[PDB]
Ligand binder design. Structure first.
Ligand code: CLA
Ligand code: CLA
Ligand code: CLA
Ligand code: CLA
Ligand code: CLA
Ligand code: CLA
Ligand code: CLA
Ligand SMILES: CCCCCCCCCCCCCCCCCC(=O)OC[C@H](CO[C@@H]1O[C@H](CO)[C@H](O)[C@H](O)[C@H]1O)OC(=O)CCCCCCCCCCCCCCCCC
Ligand SMILES: CC1=C(/C=C/C(C)=C/C=C/C(C)=C/C=C/C=C(C)/C=C/C=C(C)/C=C/C2=C(C)CCCC2(C)C)C(C)(C)CCC1
Ligand SMILES: CC1=C(/C=C/C(C)=C/C=C/C(C)=C/C=C/C=C(C)/C=C/C=C(C)/C=C/C2=C(C)CCCC2(C)C)C(C)(C)CCC1
Ligand SMILES: CC1=C(C/C=C(\C)CCC[C@H](C)CCC[C@H](C)CCCC(C)C)C(=O)c2ccccc2C1=O
Ligand code: SF4
Ligand code: SF4
Lengths: 195, 63, 95, 80, 733, 76, 152
C-alpha cells in the first residue's frame, strides 16, 4: 500500500484505479457496487471543490469579500449582489435561487440517467472538446492528475471551513496574512491549546 | 455404519439440551431398523439429570 | 408579489418538470415497485373489488402519456411551493 | 380429554407406563428401537394430566408428551 | 356446543364451575373459538370496534349530561378559580345526616362529588359556556353512539360483511387515516378553535345559529388565498388579556408566541389553532404516499424489500415483513399498543408541563389525577404491547417466510439481547439501591454531608440549552449570541424564555440530586420490566427447558414438576410477572411527580430536595406526612368530605392484600379443601335436598394468577388514587 | 395471628395500663385510653396505632435509636 | 459555579451544618466528667467531625443550597476525584477479580471432576493465579487479539 508503507492494502484495491493508493481502513468499498458509486461520487466532489477553492481565494485577493462576506448581502431583506463591483441587474435572492434550482436540478438529474458506469464518471464527448481523452495512455494519466488535484482541493476546502470555524468572519487569505505576522505565534496551536 | 466409537460429534437436533454442543459416541446400533442408532455421551447432565441420548445419523456431525 | 403570478409560475414549472425532465424517472420507479400486493397478489386480485386501478382515468392521448393524475400530482407541488413563497414573503422574518 | 402422544425417539423402557396412575399407556411391539417396543396411549379419557410419565421419560426431548385439553370429571380427578 | 360457551364445546362440556369462568375469560379471543375463519375473525373485530366506539361516545355523553344536569358549570365559568367543579349528584340511602352535610359542596343543593377529570377546564377552554351547550353536545354524542351501533350491526350482515382482502388493503387505509382521520380532523379542529373557541376567549358568543354571519377574522379569507398569511398573526391578545372577556382582546387567529397566557397559565388558543392547522397540512401531504387506484404512490412491500444493507449485516433486511405484519393481527396490535403507550406517556409529560386548558394549572388535584391516570394507562398499554408480541411469535410467526430477516435474526440472538437487559438491570439495581442505602445510613448516623449526591448535570445542561438560566451553563438558548437564540428571538423565544425561567410553573422544573436518584430508579423499572417482557416474547416459541413451547400456546399452567420444575414458564406468565414490575415503575414515577409537585405547590421545594436523597425521607416526609388528613376523613370524633377517600384508601389495602392469597397459596391446597365441602354438603340434611348443577372446583392455576393479579392491581390503583386525591385536595397543594 | 396478638398487647398496655402517675394519683397513660373508641375500626389501627406510633422509628435518624430506623426500612 | 452550586469552603449552610453537629455532640459531652471514657469518645467524634468538614472544603467539593456536597461526574477536570478517579480504581479491581475468577475456571475445566474444585477451593492453584489479575488489561486484550477470549 502506497498510502501507508508497510501496511497491506485491501484485496479489492490493486492500484489500477486512478488514485488507488490502497486507502480504505474502514473497508467501505468492499461491496463492489458501492466502490463504483464511490468512485463516481469522489470525482463529483473533486470537481466541485476544484471550482470552489479558486472561487474562495480569487475574490478575496481582489475586491472586498472573503467567501463568507460574499454571502452576507442576501438573508437580510434588501438584496444587492455585486459581481466585480457592479451590482448585477438580477442579484436578488429569489431570482438566482430559482435559477440555481432549475438549472442545477436539470443538469444533475440528467447526470443520473446515464446507465453506463464509465460515462457516469468520465462522460466525454462535449465535455472533452480538446480531445484530451483520445489517447488511452494519456487519458489515464490525466485521470490520476484529476483525482490528486481534486483530493488536494477537498483538503483545502476542509481547511478553509475549519479555519473559518476557528476565526469566524475572517477569510482564508487573511488567515495566511495573520500567520505570516509571526508564524511562531499565530498557528493552529492557539486553537488546539487555548490560553 | 455411523460414526466410530469415541467419535466427537456435534448435536444437530434442535430440541436437544446439547444442541450445537458436542459429545462422545458410545455405540452405533447396526440394526438397520433402528431409527436413532447413535448413542452419545455428554459431560453435563440435562434438566432430567441424564447424560446420554440416542440420535439419528443426520442429527450428528463429526468434528 | 402577485399571487396569481406566483401560483401560476410555480405550477407551470412543476408541470413542466413532470412532463419533460422527470417523467421517465417517475414512470420507471412506479413500474419498479408496482401495485401493492398481499401474499404475492394485488389487493384487487385477492378480491378487494374496491382496489381496482381506474384505467379509464389513467388513459391519455398526450404523447408521453402524461395524464390527469400527473396534472394533479405535479400541479399540487406547484401550489405548495407557491404558497410557501407567498406566505414566507408575507412575513418580515429576520434571521 | 387431554391429548397424549408418543414420538418415535422412544426407546421402549416402559418407565412412563409404570408411572401412570390411571393406566393410560401400554407397551406395544415395535421394530424401531433395540428394546423392540414403543409406548402407546389408548386410554386418554382416564388421563388426569399429572405428567408423571414425562418425569419418567430418559429421552433428550420427551418421547411421551401430554397436552392438557378439554376437562372432564375424569381429567379433573373428581370423586364427586 | 349446546350450552353457555357457544363458541367452545370444549368448555360447554366441562361439568365443573370452571366452564363458567373460562367462558367469560375467552369470549374475546376470537382465534380460539370453534370453527373461526380468517374472515369471521376480521369481521368480529371490526364490529367489536364499532361497539367500542359506541361505548366511548355513550360515556362522554353521560359526562356532558351529568355536568349539565347536576354540576355547577355555569357558576364555574363565571368564577373558575373559586368554584369546585361538580362531577354529579350523589344519592345514597346509607348516608347519615353528617355525611349528607359534609358532601354538600359547590353551589349545589345536595351531596355531590367534585370532578378531578378536568372536563370543566377543557370544555370551557374550547368554548362551552352554558348548561344548554352541554346538553346538545350530549345528545349529539348519543346520536354518534347509536350510529356506531348501526354500522356495527350492519357490517355483520352478509350483504355488508367486508372481505379479508379489504381488511388487508394496507396502502389505502394508511392514506385515508393519515390525510383524513388525522389531517382533516386536525384541520377541522383548528376551524373550531378559530370559529368558536377563540371568540369565546374574547367574550363573544359564536354558535350554530349565528356563526355564518360573523367573521372569524376581519379580513375574511382574503389573506388565506392571496398568501398574505401574516395578517392572521397581526394583533394578538395582550399579555394582560382576561380570558372570556374583551379586555385586551386582539384579533389574531394564528400565532407562534410560545409560553403561557399569563392569567390562565395555559397555552395561547391562537398558538393551538396554528398548531392544528400546521400539522394538518403535514398529515394531508403525508397521506398521499401510498399507491391506491391511480397509478402513483409507493408499495410498502417494495419499500421494505429494498431496505437491506449491501454488506449483509442485517441478513435479508426487511424482506417478507409486509405479509408477516399484514397477515398477523397480533403484530399489528403490538405496534399499535407500543406506539399508543409511548404517546400516552407523552400526553402525561406534556400536559402537566404545557397545559392547554385555562385554569387547570392551579387545579392541583386535577393535574395530579390526570398525570397519574395516564401514566398507569400507559403502563398497562406497554405491557400489552409485549404480550401481543409474544402471541404473535406463537400463533402467527412463520420462520420460513421470515428466514434470515431482521425479525428472525432477533430470535437467533435472543441470549445476547436478554442477557444484556439482565446486565443493565443488575447494574441499575445494585447502584441505585446501593446509593440510597448509603445516604440512609449517613442520615441515620447524623452525617448527611457524607451522602453521595450526584448532580443531574446532563439534564440540567439540557434545560440550559432550552434557555433555563438556573445553572449557569450558558448554552444555545441560554447563550447570548448562539445562532439558535438569534433565529427565534423574533418569534416564539420571548414567550418561551419567560415561561421556562418562571420557577413557579411546571415547565422544566429545577432538578438536583433527588431527581438524579429517582430517574435511575425509573430506568431500573423500565429496563427490568422490558427484561421480563422481551425474555417472555423471545422464549415464547421455545427454550432449552421447553423446546416445544410453541406447541402449547400463549397461556398454559406450566409443564409439570419434571425436568426440575416448570411453574410460570409460559409467555403469559412472563406478562403476569411484568405487570408487578410495571406497577412498581409507575408507582416510582407517580410518587416522584406528586411529591415534587406537592412541595412545589406548598412553596418549599427544599423539602423534596433534601428528604428525597434517602428512602426514609420518602416514607416519612412523603407517605406518612401526607396521610394525616386522609386517615382522619372519619375518626371517633366525626367525619368530613374526606370520608370516602379514607374508606377507599382502606378498601384498596384490602383488595391488594386479598390478591396475595391467590398469588401465594396455590391450587392443590384448595381443591382438597373443596372436596371436604362437597362431602359435607351431600351429608347435611335439608341441604341434601338442594344440588349444584355445576361441580365446585378450585380455580385453575392460570386463573388464580390472573385473579390475584387483578386484585393486586385493583387495590394498588385504588389505594394510591385515594391517597393522591385526598392529600392534594385536603389542602389544594 | 401473632402479629395482631402483639399489636393487641402493645396498644392495650400503652392505652389502659402503662403511663405516669401524679403526686396525687392522676395517671397519664402513654396513649391516654384511646384504645376503646379507636381500636374498633381498621382505620383506628391504621391512624391511631400504626401511623401514630410509627413516629418514633421514622424520626429515629440522628440519634442512638437510628439503628431501628434502618432496620425498619431494611425489614420492609 | 457548576450547576449553580458554590464551593463548600464558601458555603454558609455547610458551615451551619458543622456548627449544629458539634453543638449536638456537645449537648451529650456535657453529661460526662472530662476524664471519663464517654467524654474522650464524644470528643473523638467531635474532632473527626471537624476533620471531615475541613477536608471536604479543602478538596474542592461543591455544595448546594442544602449545605451538602454534590458530586460532579460529568468529566470536568476539577472533579475527577468524585467519579473518574475512584471509578478507574474500581474497574481495575473489578477486572482483577473477574480475570482471576476466569483463570481458575479455565485451570480446572479439563480436570477429572471439575465441580470438585468449585466447591472445595484448590487454594494452592488459587495463590498462583491471584496475581494474574495485576495485568488483566494486557492479558485480556491479548487473548482477544488471538481468538482465545471468546468462543465461536
Ligand atoms: C490544504 C492544506 C492546508 C494548508 C496549506 C493550510 C494552511 C494554513 N492553515 Mg490550515 N487546515 C487545513 C489545511 C490546510 N491549511 C485542514 C485540512 C484543516 C482542518 C484540520 C486546517 C485547520 C486549520 C486551523 C484550525 C488553523 C489553520 C491555520 C493555517 C495557517 C497556519 C499554518 C498552520 O497552523 O497549519 C495548521 C496545520 C494543520 C491543521 C495540519 C493539516 C494541514 C494540512 C492538511 C497539511 C498538509 C498540506 C498539504 C499536504 C500541502 C496556514 C495558512 C491556522 C491559522 O489560520 O492561524 C494563523 C489555524 O489556526 N488551519
Ligand atoms: C377519511 C376516511 C376515513 C376515516 C375518517 C376513517 C376513520 C376511522 N377508521 Mg377507517 N378506513 C378507511 C377510511 C377512513 N377511516 C378506508 C378507506 C379503509 C379501507 C382501506 C378503512 C378501514 C378501517 C378498518 C378496518 C377499521 C377502521 C377504523 C377506523 C376508526 C379508528 C378508531 C378511531 O376512532 O380512531 C380515532 C383516531 C383519531 C381521531 C386519530 C388521533 C390519534 C391520536 C394518537 C390521538 C390524538 C389525541 C388528541 C390529542 C386528542 C385530544 C384529546 C381529546 C380529549 C380532545 C376511525 C373512525 C377501525 C374501527 O374502529 O372501525 C370501527 C377499524 O377497525 N378503518
Ligand atoms: C386494543 C387493546 C387490546 C385488544 C383489542 C386486545 C385483544 C386481546 N387480548 Mg390483550 N392486552 C391489552 C390490550 C388489548 N388486548 C393490554 C392493554 C394488555 C395489558 C393488560 C393486554 C394483555 C393481554 C394478555 C395477557 C392476554 C390478552 C389476550 C387478548 C385476546 C382475548 C382477550 C380475552 O378473551 O379476554 C377477555 C376478558 C374478559 C371478558 C374480562 C377480563 C377482565 C379483566 C381480566 C379484569 C378487569 C378488572 C376490572 C378493572 C375490575 C374493576 C373492579 C372495580 C371495583 C373497580 C384478544 C386477542 C389474551 C389472549 O387470548 O391471548 C392469547 C391473554 O392472555 N391480552
Ligand atoms: C463502594 C464502591 C462500589 C461498590 C461496592 C460496587 C459494587 C458493584 N459494582 Mg460498581 N462501580 C463503582 C463503585 C462500586 N461498585 C464505581 C465508582 C463505578 C464507576 C467505574 C462503578 C461501575 C460499575 C460497572 C460498570 C459495573 C459495576 C458492577 C458492580 C457489581 C459487581 C462488580 C464486580 O466486581 O464483580 C466482580 C467482577 C466481575 C464479575 C467481572 C465482570 C464485571 C466487571 C465490572 C467488568 C469490568 C471489566 C470491563 C472491561 C469494564 C466494563 C466495561 C464497560 C461496561 C464500562 C457490584 C454490585 C458491575 C455490575 O453492576 O454488573 C451487573 C458492572 O458491570 N460497577
Ligand atoms: C423489593 C423487592 C424486590 C427486589 C429487591 C427484587 C430484585 C430483583 N428482581 Mg424482582 N420481583 C419482585 C420484587 C423484588 N425484586 C416481585 C414482587 C416480583 C413479581 C413476581 C418480581 C419479579 C421479578 C422478575 C420476573 C424479574 C425480577 C428481577 C429482579 C432483579 C432486578 C435487577 C436488579 O435490581 O439487580 C440488582 C439486584 C438486587 C437489587 C437484589 C438485591 C441485592 C442485595 C441487596 C445485595 C445483598 C448484599 C448483602 C451482602 C447480602 C447479605 C445477605 C446475608 C444473609 C448473606 C433483582 C434481583 C429481574 C432479574 O432477575 O433481572 C436480572 C427479573 O427477570 N423480579
Ligand atoms: C452525556 C455524555 C457525556 C459523556 C460520554 C462525556 C464524556 C467525557 N467528558 Mg463530559 N460533559 C457532558 C457530557 C458527557 N461527557 C456534559 C453535558 C457536560 C456539560 C457540563 C460535560 C462537561 C465536561 C467537561 C468540562 C469536561 C468533560 C470531560 C469528559 C471526558 C472525561 C475524561 C476523559 O476521559 O478525558 C479523555 C478525553 C478524550 C478521549 C477526548 C475528549 C475530547 C473530545 C472532543 C470529546 C469524557 C470524554 C473532560 C475532558 O474532555 O477532559 C479532557 C472535561 O474537561 N466533560
Ligand atoms: C469468574 C467469575 C465471574 C465472571 C468473570 C462473570 C462474568 C460475567 N457475568 Mg457473572 N456470575 C458469577 C461469576 C462471574 N461472572 C457468579 C458467581 C454468579 C452467581 C451470583 C453470576 C451471576 C451473573 C448474572 C445473574 C449475570 C452475570 C453477568 C455477567 C457478565 C457481565 C458482568 C456482570 O453482570 O457481573 C455480574 C456479577 C455478578 C452478578 C456476581 C458475580 C460476582 C462474584 C463475586 C465473582 C466470582 C467470585 C468467584 C468465587 C472467584 C473465585 C476465584 C478463585 C477460586 C481464584 C459477565 C460475562 C450478567 C450477564 O450475563 O451480562 C451479559 C448477568 O446478567 N453473572
Ligand atoms: C381530488 C380532488 C378533490 C380535492 C378537492 C379540494 C377542493 C377542490 C379545489 C377547489 C379549488 C378552489 C380554489 C379557488 C379559491 O378558493 O379561490 C377563491 C378566492 C376568493 O374567495 C374568498 O372569498 C371569501 C369570501 O368570504 C374571502 O372573504 C375573500 O373575499 C375571497 O378571497 O380567490 C382568491 O381570493 C384568489 C386571489 C388571487 C387574486 C386574483 C383572483 C383570481 C382568482 C383565482 C382563482 C383561481 C381558482 C382556480 C380554481 C381552478 C378550478 C378548476
Ligand atoms: C392540454 C394541453 C395544454 C394545456 C394544459 C394546461 C394549460 C394545464 C394546466 C394545468 C393546471 C393549471 C393545473 C393545476 C393544478 C392544480 C392543483 C392540482 C392544485 C393543488 C392544490 C393544492 C394541493 C393546495 C393545497 C393547499 C391548500 C388547499 C391550502 C394552502 C396550503 C396548500 C397550498 C398546501 C398545453 C397548452 C400545456 C399543451 C398542449 C396540451
Ligand atoms: C416483541 C414483539 C413486538 C413488540 C415490540 C415492542 C413492544 C416494542 C416497543 C418499542 C418502543 C416502546 C420503543 C420506543 C422507541 C422510541 C424512539 C425510537 C424514540 C426516538 C426519539 C427521537 C429520535 C427523538 C429525538 C429528538 C429529541 C430528543 C429532541 C427533539 C428533536 C428530536 C425529535 C429529533 C412486536 C409488536 C414488534 C412484534 C414482534 C414481537
Ligand atoms: C382462595 C382461592 C381458592 C378458593 C376460592 C375459589 C373457590 C373462589 C370462590 C369464589 C366465590 C364463588 C365467590 C366469588 C365472588 C366474586 C366477587 C364473584 C365475581 C363474579 C364475576 C363473574 C363478576 C382456590 O380456588 C385457589 C385456586 C388456585 C390457587 C389460589 C386460589 C385461591 O387461593
Ligand atoms: S399424564 Fe398422568 S395420567 Fe395422563 S398419561 Fe401421563 S401419567 Fe398417565
Ligand atoms: S418413557 Fe419415554 S422412552 Fe420410556 S417408554 Fe414411555 S416414552 Fe418410550
Amino acid at each position: 500500500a502506497d498510502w501507508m508503507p508497510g501496511q497491506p492494502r485491501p484485496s479489492y484495491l490493486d492500484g489500477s484505479a486512478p488514485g488507488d493508493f490502497g486507502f480504505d481502513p474502514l473497508r467501505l468499498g468492499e461491496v463492489p457496487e458501492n466502490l463504483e458509486r464511490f468512485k463516481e461520487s469522489e470525482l463529483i466532489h473533486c470537481r466541485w471543490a476544484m471550482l470552489a477553492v479558486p472561487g474562495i481565494l480569487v475574490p478575496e485577493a481582489l475586491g472586498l469579500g472573503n467567501w463568507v462576506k460574499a454571502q452576507e448581502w442576501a438573508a437580510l431583506p434588501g438584496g444587492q449582489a455585486t459581481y466585480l463591483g457592479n451590482p448585477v441587474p438580477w442579484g436578488t435572492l429569489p431570482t438566482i435561487l430559482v435559477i440555481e434550482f432549475l438549472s442545477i436540478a436539470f443538469v444533475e438529474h440528467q447526470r443520473s440517467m446515464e446507465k453506463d458506469p464509465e460515462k457516469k464518471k468520465y462522460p466525454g464527448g462535449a465535455f472533452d472538446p480538446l480531445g484530451y481523452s483520445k489517447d488511452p495512455k494519456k487519458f489515464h494519466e490525466y485521470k490520476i492528475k484529476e483525482v490528486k488535484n481534486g483530493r488536494l482541493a477537498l483538503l483545502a476546502f476542509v481547511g478553509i471551513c475549519v479555519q473559518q470555524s476557528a476565526y469566524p468572519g475572517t477569510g482564508p487569505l487573511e488567515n495566511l496574512a495573520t500567520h505570516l505576522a509571526d508564524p511562531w505565534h499565530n498557528t493552529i496551536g492557539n486553537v488546539l491549546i487555548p490560553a | 455404519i455411523g460414526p466410530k466409537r469415541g467419535a466427537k460429534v456435534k448435536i444437530l437436533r434442535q430440541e436437544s439440551y446439547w444442541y450445537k454442543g458436542t459429545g462422545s459416541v458410545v455405540a452405533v446400533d447396526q440394526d438397520p431398523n433402528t431409527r436413532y442408532p447413535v448413542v452419545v455421551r455428554f459431560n453435563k447432565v440435562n434438566y432430567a439429570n441424564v447424560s446420554t441420548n440416542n440420535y439419528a445419523l443426520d442429527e450428528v456431525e463429526e468434528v | 408579489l402577485n399571487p396569481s403570478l406566483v401560483i401560476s409560475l410555480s405550477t407551470g414549472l412543476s408541470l413542466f418538470l413532470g412532463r419533460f425532465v422527470f417523467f421517465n424517472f417517475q414512470r420507471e420507479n412506479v413500474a419498479k415497485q408496482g401495485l401493492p400486493e398481499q401474499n404475492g397478489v394485488t389487493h384487487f386480485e385477492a378480491g378487494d373489488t374496491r382496489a381496482k386501478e381506474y384505467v379509464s382515468l389513467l388513459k391519455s392521448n398526450d404523447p408521453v402519456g402524461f395524464n390527469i393524475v400527473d396534472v394533479l400530482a405535479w400541479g399540487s407541488i406547484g401550489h405548495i411551493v407557491a404558497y410557501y413563497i407567498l406566505a414566507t414573503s408575507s412575513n418580515g422574518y429576520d434571521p | 380429554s387431554h391429548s397424549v402422544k408418543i414420538y418415535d425417539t422412544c426407546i421402549g423402557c416402559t418407565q412412563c407406563v409404570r408411572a401412570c396412575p390411571t393406566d393410560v399407556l401400554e407397551m406395544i411391539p415395535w421394530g424401531g428401537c433395540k428394546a423392540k417396543q414403543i409406548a402407546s396411549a389408548p386410554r386418554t379419557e382416564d388421563c388426569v394430566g399429572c405428567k408423571r410419565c414425562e418425569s419418567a421419560c430418559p429421552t433428550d426431548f420427551l418421547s411421551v408428551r401430554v397436552y392438557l385439553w378439554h376437562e372432564t370429571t375424569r381429567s379433573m380427578g373428581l370423586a364427586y | 356446543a349446546l350450552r353457555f360457551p357457544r363458541f367452545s364445546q370444549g368448555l360447554a362440556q366441562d361439568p365443573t364451575t370452571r366452564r363458567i369462568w373460562f367462558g367469560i375469560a375467552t369470549a374475546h379471543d376470537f382465534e380460539s373459538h370453534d370453527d373461526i375463519t380468517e374472515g369471521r375473525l376480521y369481521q368480529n373485530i371490526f364490529a367489536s370496534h364499532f361497539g367500542q366506539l359506541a361505548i366511548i361516545f355513550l360515556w362522554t355523553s353521560g359526562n356532558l349530561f351529568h355536568v349539565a344536569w347536576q354540576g355547577n358549570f355555569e357558576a364555574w365559568v363565571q368564577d373558575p378559580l373559586h368554584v369546585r367543579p361538580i362531577a354529579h349528584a350523589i344519592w345514597d340511602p346509607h348516608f347519615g345526616q353528617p355525611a349528607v352535610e359534609a358532601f354538600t359542596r359547590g353551589g349545589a343543593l345536595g351531596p355531590v362529588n367534585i370532578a378531578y377529570s378536568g372536563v370543566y377546564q377543557w370544555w370551557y377552554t374550547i368554548g362551552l359556556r352554558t348548561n344548554e351547550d352541554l346538553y346538545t353536545g350530549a345528545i349529539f354524542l348519543l346520536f354518534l353512539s347509536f350510529i356506531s351501533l348501526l354500522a356495527g350491526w350492519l357490517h355483520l350482515q352478509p350483504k355488508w360483511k367486508p372481505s379479508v382482502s379489504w381488511f388487508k388493503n394496507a396502502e389505502s387505509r394508511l392514506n385515508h387515516h393519515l390525510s383524513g382521520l388525522f389531517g382533516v380532523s386536525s384541520l377541522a379542529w383548528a376551524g373550531h378553535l378559530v370559529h368558536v373557541a377563540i371568540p369565546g376567549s374574547r367574550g363573544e358568543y359564536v354558535r350554530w345559529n349565528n356563526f355564518l354571519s360573523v367573521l372569524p377574522h376581519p379580513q375574511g379569507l382574503g389573506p388565506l388565498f392571496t398568501g398574505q398569511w401574516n395578517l392572521y398573526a397581526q394583533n394578538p391578545d395582550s399579555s394582560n388579556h382576561l380570558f372570556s372577556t374583551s379586555q385586551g382582546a386582539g384579533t389574531a387567529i394564528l400565532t407562534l408566541l410560545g409560553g403561557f397566557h399569563p392569567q390562565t397559565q395555559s397555552l395561547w388558543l391562537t398558538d393551538m389553532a396554528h398548531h392544528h392547522l400546521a400539522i394538518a397540512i403535514l398529515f394531508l401531504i403525508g397521506g398521499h404516499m401510498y399507491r391506491t387506484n391511480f397509478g402513483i404512490g409507493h408499495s410498502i412491500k417494495y419499500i421494505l424489500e429494498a431496505h437491506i444493507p449491501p454488506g449483509g449485516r442485517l441478513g435479508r433486511g426487511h424482506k417478507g415483513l409486509y405479509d408477516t405484519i399484514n397477515n398477523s393481527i397480533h403484530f399489528q396490535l403490538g405496534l399499535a399498543l407500543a406506539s399508543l403507550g409511548v404517546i400516552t406517556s407523552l400526553v402525561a409529560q406534556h400536559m402537566y408541563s404545557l397545559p392547554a386548558y385555562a385554569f387547570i394549572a392551579q387545579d392541583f388535584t386535577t393535574q395530579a389525577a390526570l398525570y397519574t391516570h395516564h401514566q398507569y394507562i400507559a403502563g398497562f398499554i406497554m405491557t400489552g404491547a409485549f404480550a401481543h408480541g409474544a402471541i404473535f411469535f406463537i400463533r402467527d410467526y412463520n420462520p420460513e417466510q421470515n428466514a434470515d430477516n431482521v425479525l428472525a435474526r432477533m430470535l437467533e440472538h435472543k441470549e445476547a439481547i436478554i442477557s444484556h437487559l439482565s446486565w443493565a438491570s443488575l447494574f441499575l439495581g445494585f447502584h441505585t439501591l446501593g446509593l440510597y442505602v448509603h445516604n440512609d445510613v449517613m442520615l441515620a448516623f447524623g452525617t448527611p454531608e457524607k451522602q453521595i449526591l450526584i448532580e443531574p448535570i446532563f439534564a440540567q445542561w439540557i434545560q440550559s440549552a432550552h434557555g433555563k438560566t438556573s445553572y449557569g451553563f450558558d448554552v444555545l438558548l441560554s447563550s447570548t449570541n448562539s445562532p439558535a437564540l438569534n433565529a427565534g428571538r423574533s418569534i416564539w423565544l420571548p414567550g418561551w424564555l419567560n415561561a421556562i425561567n418562571e420557577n413557579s410553573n411546571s415547565l422544566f422544573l429545577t432538578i438536583g440530586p433527588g431527581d438524579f436518584l429517582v430517574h435511575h430508579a425509573i430506568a431500573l423499572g423500565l429496563h427490568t420490566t422490558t427484561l421480563i417482557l422481551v425474555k417472555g416474547a423471545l422464549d415464547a416459541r421455545g427454550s432449552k427447558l421447553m423446546p416445544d413451547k410453541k406447541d402449547f400456546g400463549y397461556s398454559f399452567p406450566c409443564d409439570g414438576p419434571g425436568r426440575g420444575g416448570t411453574c410460570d414458564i409460559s409467555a403469559w406468565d412472563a406478562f403476569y410477572l411484568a405487570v408487578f414490575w410495571m406497577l412498581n415503575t409507575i408507582g416510582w414515577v407517580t410518587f416522584y411527580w406528586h411529591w415534587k409537585h406537592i412541595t412545589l405547590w406548598q412553596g418549599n421545594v427544599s423539602q423534596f430536595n433534601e428528604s428525597s436523597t434517602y428512602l426514609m425521607g420518602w416514607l416519612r416526609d412523603y407517605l406518612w406526612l401526607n396521610s394525616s388528613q386522609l386517615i382522619n376523613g372519619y375518626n371517633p370524633f366525626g367525619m368530613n368530605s374526606l370520608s370516602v377517600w379514607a374508606w377507599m384508601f382502606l378498601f384498596g389495602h384490602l383488595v391488594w392484600a386479598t390478591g396475595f392469597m391467590f398469588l401465594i397459596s396455590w391450587r392443590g391446597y384448595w381443591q382438597e379443601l373443596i372436596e371436604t365441602l362437597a362431602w359435607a354438603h351431600e351429608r347435611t340434611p335439608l341441604a341434601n335436598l338442594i344440588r349444584w348443577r355445576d361441580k365446585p372446583v378450585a380455580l385453575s392455576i392460570v386463573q388464580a394468577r390472573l385473579v390475584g393479579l387483578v386484585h393486586f392491581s385493583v387495590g394498588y390503583i385504588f389505594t394510591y388514587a385515594a391517597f393522591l386525591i385526598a392529600s392534594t385536595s385536603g389542602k389544594f397543594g | 395471628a401473632i402479629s395482631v396478638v402483639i399489636f393487641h398487647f402493645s396498644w392495650k398496655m400503652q392505652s389502659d395500663v402503662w403511663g405516669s402517675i401524679n403526686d396525687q394519683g392522676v395517671v397519664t397513660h402513654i396513649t391516654g385510653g384511646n384504645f376503646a373508641q379507636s381500636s374498633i375500626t381498621i382505620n383506628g389501627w391504621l391512624r391511631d396505632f400504626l401511623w401514630a406510633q410509627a413516629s418514633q422509628v421514622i424520626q429515629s435518624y440522628g440519634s442512638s435509636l437510628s439503628a431501628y430506623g434502618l432496620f425498619f426500612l431494611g425489614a420492609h | 459555579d457548576i450547576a449553580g452550586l458554590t464551593p463548600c469552603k464558601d458555603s454558609k449552610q455547610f458551615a451551619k451544618r458543622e456548627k449544629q453537629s458539634i453543638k449536638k455532640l456537645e449537648s451529650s459531652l456535657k453529661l460526662y466528667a472530662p476524664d471519663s471514657a464517654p467524654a474522650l469518645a464524644i470528643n473523638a467524634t467531635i474532632e473527626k467531625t471537624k476533620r471531615r468538614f475541613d477536608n471536604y472544603g479543602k478538596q474542592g467539593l461543591l455544595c448546594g443550597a442544602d449545605g451538602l456536597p454534590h458530586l460532579i461526574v460529568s468529566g470536568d477536570q476539577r472533579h475527577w476525584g468524585e467519579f473518574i478517579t475512584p471509578g478507574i480504581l474500581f474497574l481495575y479491581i473489578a477486572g482483577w477479580i473477574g480475570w482471576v475468577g476466569r483463570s481458575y475456571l479455565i485451570a480446572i475445566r479439563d480436570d477429572k471432576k471439575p465441580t470438585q474444585k468449585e466447591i472445595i477451593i484448590d487454594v494452592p492453584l488459587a495463590t498462583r493465579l491471584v496475581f494474574r489479575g495485576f495485568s488483566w488489561p494486557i492479558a485480556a486484550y491479548r487473548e482477544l487479539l488471538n481468538g482465545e477470549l471468546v468462543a465461536k
